[model samples]
Target chain A: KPITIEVVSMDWKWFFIYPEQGIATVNEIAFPANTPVYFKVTSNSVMNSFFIPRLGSQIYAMAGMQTRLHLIANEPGTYDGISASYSGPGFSGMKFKAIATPDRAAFDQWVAKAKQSPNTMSDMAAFEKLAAPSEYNQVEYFSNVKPDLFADVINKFMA
Target chain B: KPITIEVVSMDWKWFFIYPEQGIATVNEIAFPANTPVYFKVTSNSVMNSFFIPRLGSQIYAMAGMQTRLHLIANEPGTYDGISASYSGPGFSGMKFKAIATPDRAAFDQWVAKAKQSPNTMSDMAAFEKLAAPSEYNQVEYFSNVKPDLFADVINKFMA
Candidate 1:
């Protein structure tokens, strides 16, 4: 079945959270191929726009306001997101990874593996560090990620 | 005379670029008392809000979008502005200092001094620097300011 992806675009980086699975990813994402995907996007820093040409449409990730977009991955491949709006020096560091799995079971397996990984955005400093400027690298996944933690980041400090 | 004050709110700061004069301020602003002012607002950064409680009105500053509000200060006082909608860090440092001038001539004189200042922002930089998280400061009259600067900003580097 097609799944839902919760995405929050921040200054120079992105956070992908799967609410249903209680998992998320920073700077990377994945979904089942040939399935409809709904994305709920917001922002933590400046206003950034999300565009994956191969994913069918673009949506805005704004602060305080939530934007929604629906798309489907016709094929399984790596599609990187492009930041359509400029925020600041972080603009040069703007990019994210998206992977399309072939099926639900396969995606579940991928998530399980992400949970076991040690290199994850584990805390506030970790998130900030990962978001720092770097070369346009490919997408990365984190096994033990949490989306609600991001909300805490917003409510505690940046909010 | 009724003066139109064209203003915009960006991430982490406020920009008061007097197109009529060409000067801009980071967090400070001023206008002549007894003169009606129409403010045209837009955002070059993340979504932000424009508000002056002392002026009794507020509005959103959306990216690449413009909204207008009419306000008139009847007396001299410093007013504070903030983003009504949460915009992350972009919304945190956003503020404005509005001083209602005693008369049109005083306002003109202030503009004259600002025009001669060496730190004035370039027409396009007006939109760019508006979104940065810099310390709050004020500047005076920008005599060389052009009307086309606003048009160019609204077009988002397209023109």
Candidate 2:
């Protein structure tokens, strides 16, 4: 199964939501290896750059704008994503992780386990909160996400 | 007489040097009105934007890059030069003063008088001494700037 990663850039943070697997990560983002992954990128405020040098793709996520990146990893490794443009006080520490999963089923299992965590968070709220300086972040899963949530973001309501 | 305001945006501060008047204002800037004022823009660190919105126009001043804006204000007012682009902590709250004079002759007099103040500075020194959280800037008057300067900045440099 192909995994779709919806990535969003905020004032000084990055949010990755893997809707199909019902899991999301704050700062720590991942996709399965050797799969044609489609990355839809947007920013909550201002304009920011989504750059994962090792992944061989970069795009600008601007307010009222979205960009797309198609990337495939031949092997699993921890790649890095850093904001290429200057944002604000949060700019210096704005960085995230990109993990390449061994397979789609493995990623799905990881998501299932994450959704049971105590803190049930919303992606937008997480984006706003994580705008502060933070660690490389851990992955968490969500059991129930609205079917049209991703579509809502694409339509300009980044809820 | 034509008032010439040469402005440059760097990592942390702004420099307005008037070569013609042989006096410069660092961080604090002023210009005379009703004169064909030309501003030469350049950056010594990262890419930054130089904008004086009230009077009109914005220019990108990139490191190892230069741009120019031709502006002449009909009235004299204290305008603020803001950094519209991101450049880390060196960006926000980074601003300068723009005082438009009544005419070019008055500007020449102001520069000539300020030369005796004993706090004369140069661009090279500014590149070294100023970095972050500092205000002292470099503004000067250029009685005659190379005509090719604007052409080089606007046409070749910007493109």
Candidate 3:
């Protein structure tokens, strides 16, 4: 019942990258209903707090630091998720939707659909631009996310 | 002429301390119309963004670092003030009113009224309690504000 979701907090959006599935999304997340989802979170910008109020406790996402949270949704539905910490001008608009699908099959179907999107993350340079501050960001789907990008983001600030 | 306002970003709210007037307010700021206001801002906790959309640019409020902003309100009215960045659970409710009075006399009168409030920001301990996170913060007034508290808050983060 354990599934891992990697999350990166960029300037004004939440980037949820699923390493297991090789898929990613901006400002949107999905998991199987009734299953515990483990979130491995970090930030590429200033400090941010990651929280899904209905699911449980909030955790901080700091630059070069990784944090973990375990959460589950008994019911299949969409819940609100947001950055609990203020980081910049686009903070208030930094929100994402957490969709808990009815079952694992539905969740996998979502991943497959997302992987068919025309857009791809491309490279780190493109990600740096996304990390720039702005407001009211739109949801984005990345068919392919670079491997080890999360670790690279965290280590970039390390001495 | 320009009036200086020291803004302290605390957990879930903003503290606008008018050192010249010896008064402070939470989630509300007032100044004379057509007068330039200089803001020396910092955060008591994590970083936050200070922004007023109709007025102008947004700036980051960081711990131990003082960021300055100069803004002028051309017309007398009430504008929205918000922590453009996300901080915590209280972030969605992190809003304030920026009131631009018609003249210096009107501004002064407003300050005089605020000075009659029974509450006082007497020391750092009081601030520590206020800095604890929450949501939907209400407007508060401090009849007396401790001097140089802003500097003290910044210096606490300095190595």
Candidate 4:
């Protein structure tokens, strides 16, 4: 089955939520090689581009809307990723890592490890703080994430 | 002898001039390991920063201003350098490389190679075009650079 990662772009950082795995991460994303992966990209306030240079695709994210991009890593490697757009003073620091695991087994093992994080994207209040404008944030993992969190983010602009 | 490099930051790229050597390069810098290096940093237009993380110091660059920083690389390596501050749409792509040569001999040899480039920073008209907004520019070498070029850049803003 293909994996879907919902991306939320903020001022100078990125949030990646794995809905199926019930986990989320900041400034990092990982999946197994050759696996079809889909990214649903959106933003909190300003516009940003989602791009992993080696991934061969680039997508944009903006308030009140979502854009989609498909990706598949041909091999296992750790690649640098960026917003690919200027947002604010922190734009220069808005960077992330894209990791490709060797296989499904390794990907599952990594997901299990991610679930060990104690932090959880529990409520709107919690998400609000995490989505605030900031720059150069270290990688973070959330053990649990709300299933409909992405919908909430998109709905916020509409309402 | 301490090597002095004058850095001129523009909208999205770096111009590094070795005042003593009368040579200039774009988006790249190299120096002998263990030699004291001095940087006189200024900008052609908008605000930016000169930073090589492993070098342990970051200094800002602005129009009509100058900042000085001293540096030394203890080992031979290629380190990532960046405009630690935002510039504009090109900000995220404003990156450069810092190379530390093994010894004085190696550094001098590299300079000889750089001098082979036919491109020269010939006049203010050429510079005016080069300093215009750009992003993700490739490393370029200028075999000949005008003397007193650094002072001219600073003086243009003060006028």
Candidate 5:
């Protein structure tokens, strides 16, 4: 099976949770090159587009909708990514970087680097702060991400 | 006044019509940098996300509704653009390039080059074929695109 990357679009930023790796990141995504990357995309605000041009087509991440996109990076390089759909004033600054490592070892190293961060995303309070409207956001890493947090976002609209 | 680009998202492809210039292109779009680009976006099939990541946020291309987006590219480069929504089996291949040229003269040159193409999109039959499900579409230019074709697409679903 391909590695699943749960993608969430907040007010003005992107949140990527790698369930298999137990890591989360804002404005950054990484995976092994030549491996299939399955993306489960959603949004916490209005609708947004989860797009990395060098890798594949854009997919919608909407507030109450869940969309899926499957893609692979044939080349090992860092590619620019962005929320293609506009949500608010900060829409233009919603950019991110997607790195496709040459091998799994390199991907692991990248994950290790993310794991050293002091931040944690374990509750709604933390997410509320993260989802606040902002622009030109810097990349952030969370070593302790809540389990099935992606499902929680999706199911919130369901209930 | 800002340059207007009528953007249409079909099944598995994108069609960009420079209505004032009487030119059209599939899977490619170009505009001048440091100028406002007014995109009137809609879809002929299912809803698609019209997104050019490096330039700005994606917007929904619905069947009947015309959504508007204003974007400006500060840098002159080829940025990745794609359909940020899942339509069908060929969804992953719905990718394109959004080029920001240096000046209006350069943009005119690009449009003139497009006008030299032998193909034309003057009627609905051609558009039906173009809207068919296909993967990995090649860039195509239409010298004589129908001026009202975009409006027709938007209105078709209205009645």
Candidate 6:
């Protein structure tokens, strides 16, 4: 099965939710090289364009809207993901490390290690607080990925 | 007497609420020049910095706190107000025209004329909808700010 990751853009930061992996991270991401990666992207705030610095397509994210992008990292390498569109002052600094692990085992190791993080999103409300724009801090890790978070973020704007 | 205005910042826009005047405008504001103007600023989304370009001190807007800034334009000028801090996709375009009317009569005339606009906040829920991040539209004029809107914006983040 292809690896699926939920990409959430909020004020001045990026969140990568690996629902299948049951782990989430802020301003950082990792996947096995050569494996097909499916990305489901949306915004928690204004419009932002998500781009994998060296890999492929640039996707636009909007609050309430979900866009899909699929790709594969041919070789294991470290690169950056940037907000292709200027959203605000934090735009320049909204960069995330995109790591294409050397292999599937390495990727799994990263996920398992990430789960050890003490912080958890807890629920949608917790995610809401994180989504709020503020000073950029270090990367964050959430163990649960909180089942319905991605759904709630988009649904809040739906009706 | 000081003319007080409420400022609410969102994903990519600026809202100016004249609670005392019973009117509100999106991305546009006006007041009497050479008269003290009090600005009560906060955010409906992430944190933002509010500054009247070429005018007063830049004030930071937090979601839960009401920060205040007071100033008087020395001259009648159509200067602009901007998000001094990077907010989100809408930050670059989050500028409102700051009009300092020539005199109190002129300022009142502007307010009276603004009251003629058909649109209004209607209630707090309507304001919530407006605060949601979206594509940048034209300057919005709200004849009635509706009551207690500013208080609600800041309170939602508190307990």
Candidate number of the best lDDT: 4
What docking grade applies to model 1? incorrect
What is the per-residue lDDT of model 1 for residues A1-159, given as tens digits with 9 covering 90 to 100? Answer: 658787777556677877676666767877888888888788765556788877767887765556889888878877877776543344656777678877777888878877776676556666656554344444566655545654654452233
The numbered model that scores best in DockQ is 1
DockQ of model 6 vs. true complex: 0.06
Q: Show where candidate 1 strays beyond 4 Å.
A: A1-4, A11-14, A18-27, A32-39, A44-62, A65-97, A103-119, A124-147, A153-159, B85-92, B123-130, B134-147, B157-159
Q: lDDT for model 2, on a 0 to 1 scale?
A: 0.61
In what order do the candidates fall by DockQ, top score first? Answer: 1, 6, 3, 2, 5, 4
lDDT of 6: 0.79
Backbone-clash count (model 5): 5
Interface RMSD of each: 6.2, 12.5, 13.1, 15.4, 14.3, 14.3
lDDT of 2 by residue, B58-153 (tens): 998754355778887888777887875542333565777777866666665666667656554543333334433343435533333333332333
Q: Which stretches of candidate 3 lie over 4 Å from their true place?
A: A1-159, B85-88
Model 1 — interface RMS deviation?
A: 6.2
List the candidate 5 regions with Cα displacement exceeding 4 Å.
Answer: A1-159, B85-88
Error of 2 at A131 (Å): 3.0
Fnat of all models, as shown: 0.19, 0.00, 0.05, 0.00, 0.00, 0.02
* Quality of model 3 by C-alpha lDDT: 0.81
What shift in Å separates residue B16 of candidate 1 from its native position after superposition? 1.0
- Please say which candidate is ahead in DockQ: 1 or 5: 1
**CA lDDT of every candidate:** 0.67, 0.61, 0.81, 0.82, 0.81, 0.79
Off by over 4 Å in 6: A85-87, B1-14, B17-159
Q: After superposition, how far is residue B70 of candidate 1 from its true place, in Å?
A: 2.6
Model 6 chain B worst lDDT window (10 residues): B83-92
